[PDB]
Structure 1
Amino acid sequence: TYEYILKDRAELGSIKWQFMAVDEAHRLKNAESSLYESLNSFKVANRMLITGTPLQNNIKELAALVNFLMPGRF
């Protein structure tokens, strides 16, 4: 659950992970999120978001999604 991520950010951060799944990943809408840089610490190799979030409402999220999957790329 999304609660539990943040309540125990630390223990998962240490153990290695290389594959990520998330449900209804329109959460990462703003680039100022708490789970937005919470997820970045979890040593990871590949990610996988899966939601139908429309990506023209704001250009922020369109960019946020691109920045989050690939840190660096417009």
Structure 2
Amino acid sequence: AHRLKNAESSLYESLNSFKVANRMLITGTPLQNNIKELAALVNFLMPGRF
């Protein structure tokens, strides 16, 4: 899921437009450079709560 660490990358808008009820991310490094990567991951998971 670290490949999904960028919100502006085309994979993010490709996977965020999918009509899926439940999502899950498997990764080894959740944070790599800053808090914004984790913010993008939790926005992909829960869009609005965090």
For this structure pair, what is the TM-score category when the shorter chain's length is used for normalisation? 0.7 to 0.9
What 5-or-longer segments of structure 2 have no aligned partner? none
Greater strand content: 1
What 5-or-longer segments of structure 1 have no aligned partner? 1-24
Identical pairs, percent: 100
Question: TM-score normalized by structure 1?
Answer: 0.59
Q: Deviations over 1:29-72 (max 9, x none)?
A: 12111010100121100011111114262111111111110111
Q: Deviations over 1:1-20 (max 9, x none)?
A: xxxxxxxxxxxxxxxxxxxx
> Whose relative contact order is higher, 1 or 2, with alpha carbons under 8 Å and at least 6 apart?
2
The count of aligned residue pairs is: 50
Question: TM-score normalized by structure 2?
Answer: 0.81
Shift >2 Å, 4+ stretches: none
From the CA coordinates, give the structure whose radius of gyration is larger: 1
